[PDB]
Amino acid sequence: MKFTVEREHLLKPLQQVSGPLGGRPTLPILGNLLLQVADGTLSLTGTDLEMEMVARVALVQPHEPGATTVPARKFFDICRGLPEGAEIAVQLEGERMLVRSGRSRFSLSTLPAADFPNLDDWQSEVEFTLPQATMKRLIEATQFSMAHQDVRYYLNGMLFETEGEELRTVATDGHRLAVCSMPIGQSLPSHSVIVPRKGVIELMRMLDGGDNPLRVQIGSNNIRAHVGDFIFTSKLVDGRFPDYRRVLPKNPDKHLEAGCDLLKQAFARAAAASNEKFRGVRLYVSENQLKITANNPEQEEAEEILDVTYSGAEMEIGFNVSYVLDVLNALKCENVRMMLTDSVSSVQIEDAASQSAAYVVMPMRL
Amino acid sequence: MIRLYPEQLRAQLNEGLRAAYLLLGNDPLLLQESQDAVRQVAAAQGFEEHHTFSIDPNTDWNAIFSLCQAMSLFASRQTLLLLLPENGPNAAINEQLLTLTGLLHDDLLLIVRGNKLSKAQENAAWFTALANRSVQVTCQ
C-alpha cells in the first residue's frame, strides 16, 4: 500500500481513531491503527474491543491498495510534528512503514492487518436517519443521569428505544432519571438497547451539529453511527434496563411552576448556606409559595421564600441540590414545572413549554 | 452487641440480618468470606445497590453521608461496605463514623471492615452508638 496526503487532511482523523484510548496496551496490537487503502479511500481504524472508530479519507493524489497496522501514537506524533501544509507520502516496505515529507523520513514497525481484532460485519435489526442536532439533543438532555461504575452495570449506560416515528433515550442511576423523545419522521419498529457509558460519550463527542445528517444502525450486540467520514461502533450492555414508565409519579396532584433561573439562584444560595452539603435542601410548598431551606437539624435556620405558582395541598420534602440543579441546568429555559405527590415519592421536573424532556428525581430522607 | 466468629456467620446472618456488621481482624480469607456472606444474604432481601469506600484522608464523605440520605426510584436497598485503614480508624474517622452512625436507617446495611479494633480505642463515639444494634464478626 501507498498514499500521499496533505498533512491537514490526515490530522483530524488520525486524532479521532486513536482517540480516547491510551491507557495501556492490554495487548500490543491494540496500540495500533489499521490502515487500509483500496478504491480511492484510506480507512483508519482504532479499537479497544468495546468500541471502534473508523475514519475514511479520500485519496486524491495517486495511491496504491494494501493494508497494515502501525503504532497509533507514534504515527500521529510524526504527522503532528511536521510543518503545516506539508504533504505526507506514506509507503509500506517490508514489515516497516515509511512516512516521508520533504526531507524528513521515518519508518515505523508494523503488525499484520489480519491480526487486527477488527469486527467482522454484523446485521442491523433496525436503522434510520436523524439530524446530528437531534441526536445531540437526546444525549445532552439525559446523559448526566447515567450511572457511573454502579454495581448494576445495566445502569452505567444510556437506553435507546424506538416506537412510532420516535427515538428516545433514558438514563438513570437509581436516584434521578432523565428521558427525552424526538420525532424522526420514520416508521420504526419498536426496539430497545443499552449503549455503554463510554459509547455514549464518544457518540456525543463526534457530533459537530453540522449539515451531515447522522445515520444509525442497531444490530443485536452492537450499534453503529455514520457521521460523515467517521463510523462509530460500540457493544451494547447485556442486561435489562428498568422500566422508566413505572417510576414516573402517577396522576400527580401537586403542581408548582417557577422561574427556572430563579429556582436555580435560590438553590445556589441554599447550597452556599449549608455547612453540611450532604444534608441537602428542604422545600415547603403552600398555595402559590415555596419556602426553600438548606437543612441542618441542630441549628436554627434562615429560609428563603419564593413567589411561585402552586396550589392544592401544602407539603414539605427534602432534595439533593445536585440532582435538582442538574435538571435546571439541563432544562435551559424561562419557566419550570414540577409535579409532586409525597415527601417520600418521586417528583417530575419539566420545561413549562415543551415536553420532549422529562426528569424524575427521588426526594431525600430529610 | 453480638460477637460471633467467621465460622458461625452463615447461621446468625441467616436468621438475623443487622443494620451494621463489624468484620474486624487481619485475616485475608475470613474477612472476605464474612462480607461475601453478608453481601450474599443481603442481595437476598432487596439489596441490588452496593457500594464500598477505601477510608483514608481523601474519601469524599458527603457521597457516603448523602448516600445514606438518598431514596431509590426502584426501592433497591443498599449495602454500604467500608474498607477501614489497616491501622484502625484515624484521628477523626471517629467523628464521621459517628456522624454515619446517625445517618443509619433500615434500608442501609452498614458493613465496616479492617483488622482488630484499635486496642482500647474502641471507645470512639460511633462504635458506642452501633454497639447495641449490630454484630461483630471475629475474622481475626
From Swiss-Prot, chain A:
Forms a ring-shaped head-to-tail homodimer around DNA, which can be opened by the delta subunit. Binds interacting factors in a hydrophobic surface cleft between domains 2 and 3, each monomer is able to bind different proteins simultaneously. The beta* isoform probably forms homotrimers which probably load onto DNA. The DNA polymerase III holoenzyme complex contains at least 10 different subunits organized into 3 functionally essential subassemblies: the Pol III core, the beta sliding clamp processivity factor and the clamp-loading complex. Belongs to the beta sliding clamp family. Small molecules can bind to the hydrophobic cleft and inhibit binding of various protein factors, suggesting this may make and attractive antibiotic target. InterPro entries: DNA_clamp_sf, DNA_polIII_beta, DNA_polIII_beta_C, DNA_polIII_beta_cen, DNA_polIII_beta_N. Changing residue 66 to E: In dnaN159; a temperature- and UV-sensitive mutation, displays altered DNA polymerase usage, chronically induced SOS response. SUPFAM superfamilies: DNA clamp (SSF55979). Induction: Part of the dnaA-dnaN-recF-gyrB operon, but also transcribed from at least 3 promoters within the upstream dnaA gene, induced at 42 degrees Celsius. Induced 1.5-fold by hydroxyurea. A shorter isoform, beta* is induced by UV treatment and also at low levels in late logarithmic/early stationary phase growth (at protein level). Beta* transcription induced by naldixic acid. The keyword Cytoplasm applies. The temperature- and UV-sensitive allele dnaN159 does not grow at temperatures higher than 37 degrees Celsius. The global SOS response is chronically induced. The UV-sensitivity of dnaN159 is dependent upon Pol IV (dinB), it has an enhanced Pol V-dependent mutation rate (umuC, umuD), and is absolutely dependent on the polymerase activity of Pol I (polA) for viability. This is Beta sliding clamp. One of its GO terms (cellular component) is Hda-beta clamp complex. Keywords: Cytoplasm, DNA replication, DNA-binding, DNA-directed DNA polymerase, Nucleotidyltransferase, Transferase. Changing residue 133 to T: Reduction of synthesis of beta*, probably due to mutation of its promoter. It comes from Escherichia coli (strain K12). Residues 1-120 are annotated as: 1. Changing residue 146 to L: No effect on synthesis of beta*. DNA binds at residues 24, 73, 149, 153-154. Residues 245-365 are annotated as: 3. It comes from the Bacteria. One of its GO terms (biological process) is regulation of DNA-templated DNA replication initiation. Residues 129-243 are annotated as: 2. NCBIfam families: dnan. It is found in: Cytoplasm. Its main location: cytoplasm. One of its GO terms (molecular function) is DNA binding. The gene is dnaN.
Curated annotation (Swiss-Prot), chain B:
It comes from the Bacteria. One of its GO terms (molecular function) is DNA binding. One of its GO terms (biological process) is DNA replication. Keywords: DNA replication, DNA-directed DNA polymerase, Nucleotidyltransferase, Transferase. One of its GO terms (cellular component) is DNA polymerase III complex. The keyword ATP-binding does not apply. Residues 1-140 are annotated as: Domain 1. Has three domains, each of which is closely related to a corresponding domain in the delta' stator, despite the 2 proteins having only 6-8% sequence identity. Interacts with the beta sliding clamp via domain 1 (residues 1-140, in particular residues 61-74), fitting into a cleft between domains 2 and 3 on the surface of the beta-clamp. Residues 61-74 move about 45 degrees and 5.5 Angstroms in the beta-delta versus gamma-delta-delta' structure to contact respectively the beta or delta'. Belongs to the DNA polymerase HolA subunit family. Part of the beta sliding clamp loading complex, which hydrolyzes ATP to load the beta clamp onto primed DNA to form the DNA replication pre-initiation complex. DNA polymerase III is a complex, multichain enzyme responsible for most of the replicative synthesis in bacteria. This DNA polymerase also exhibits 3'-5' exonuclease activity. The delta subunit is the wrench that will open the beta subunit dimer, which has been modeled to leave a gap large enough for ssDNA to pass through. The DNA polymerase III holoenzyme complex contains at least 10 different subunits organized into 3 functionally essential subassemblies: the Pol III core, the beta sliding clamp processivity factor and the clamp-loading complex. The Pol III core (subunits alpha, epsilon and theta) contains the polymerase and the 3'-5' exonuclease proofreading activities. The polymerase is tethered to the template via the dimeric beta sliding clamp processivity factor. This is DNA polymerase III subunit delta. The chain holds residues 1 to 140 of 343 of the full protein.
